[PDB]
Amino acid sequence: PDVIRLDSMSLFDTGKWVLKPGSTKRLVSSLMDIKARPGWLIVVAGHTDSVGEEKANQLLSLKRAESVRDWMRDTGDVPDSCFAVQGYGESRPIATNDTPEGRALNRRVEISLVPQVDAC
Ligand SMILES: [Cl-]
């Protein structure tokens, strides 16, 4: 009974929490992974690049997790109680913040499926 980590999804432009154009294939991919594990808690964690202010990035990271939760629930018909949203702000980069490509990779959402918590 291991937690399942889905692939990271870098779906956001600077200071934005809306799902940028061309995000549908990566979203559908996570959705399918969610549909294969009915009832697992869907932990949706948002992240930011290190540009801007730490407190501002915390709120932004959480709004990004909420945008993905909202898509999965409204477009993916996943019950609302399945989700738990989390924000890491700029604290856990996956790429350098020294380049635009690196910062774009850090603007992202990570999904973990947790079986020990009942959620749906
Ligand atoms: Cl926005």
Q: Where are the domains of the chain?
A: 1-120
Nearest to 6 by CA among 40, 38, 24, 31: 31
- The two structure tokens encoding residue 9: 């999804």
Method used experimentally:
X-ray
Give distance in angstroms: CA of 115 to centre of ligand 1: 32
- Reported in sequence order, the residue ranges of 26-105 that DSSP labels E, i.e. its strands, are 40-46, 83-87
Q: Which of 88, 83, 95 is nearest to 109 (CA)?
A: 88
DSSP annotation of 9: B
39: region left, alpha or beta (phi > 0 left; psi from -120 to 50 alpha): left
d(C-alpha 102, C-alpha 117), whole Å: 34
Order of strands across the sheet that contains 4-5 = 4-5, 109-118, 40-46, 83-87
CA torsion, ordered 7, 114, 119, 76, to nearest 10 deg: 10
Distance CA 34, CA 104 (A): 25
Q: How many angstroms is it from 42 CA to the middle of ligand 1?
A: 23
**Angle of helix 54-74 versus helix 24-35 axis, rounded to 10:** 70
Residue 17 Cα to ligand 1 midpoint, Å, equals 4
